[PDB]
Amino acid sequence: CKSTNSILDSWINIHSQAGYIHKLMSDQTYLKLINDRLHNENVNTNDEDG
Amino acid sequence: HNLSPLQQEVLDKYKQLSLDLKALDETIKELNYSQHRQQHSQQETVSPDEILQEMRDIEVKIGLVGTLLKGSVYSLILQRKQEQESLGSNSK
Numbered sequence: 001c002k003s004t005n006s007i008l009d010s011w012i013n014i015h016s017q018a019g020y021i022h023k024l025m026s027d028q029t030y031l032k033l034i035n036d037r038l039h040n041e042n043v044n045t046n047d048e049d050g
Numbered sequence: 051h052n053l054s055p056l057q058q059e060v061l062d063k064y065k066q067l068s069l070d071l072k073a074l075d076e077t078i079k080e081l082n083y084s085q086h087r088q089q090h091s092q093q094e095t096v097s098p099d100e101i102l103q104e105m106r107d108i109e110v111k112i113g114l115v116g117t118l119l120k121g122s123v124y125s126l127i128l129q130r131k132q133e134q135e136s137l138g139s140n141s142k
Contacts, residue, residue, distance in 0.1 A: 001104050008111045015114070 024030060040050060055122065060090070084097035094100060 001100070001108060004108055005104075008108065008115070011115065012111065 040047065081095055082097075083095050085091060086094050086097060086099055093132075094129075098104065
């Protein structure tokens, strides 16, 4: 029973992280920001502060 | 108080019987002690840590594995049925 519980808490952790990052991927603004961040790093990787 | 030899044999047999009687009573109790890690012990004795406190702990989250798949499939079927009845009733 204890081992089953441990497996289930591992599943719980996985699904919690899945939900958080799904919330992240839900917002279009953050994805746009990381997209032009990728393009900026393509043109200039130095300006991380930008 | 002198006694017949048969009576004395009955008596000390009764004594031994009482001895393993309270021995078995102590054993059954020790099984029933929920004193797991409360008294000096490191073995689990059948108690809520084997029952609802534990099995229910499992159960409040096992539904997230088994019954939730069904529930999702049933919800899709229910939505499909809703769409079908709406279209059928409104089209005619």
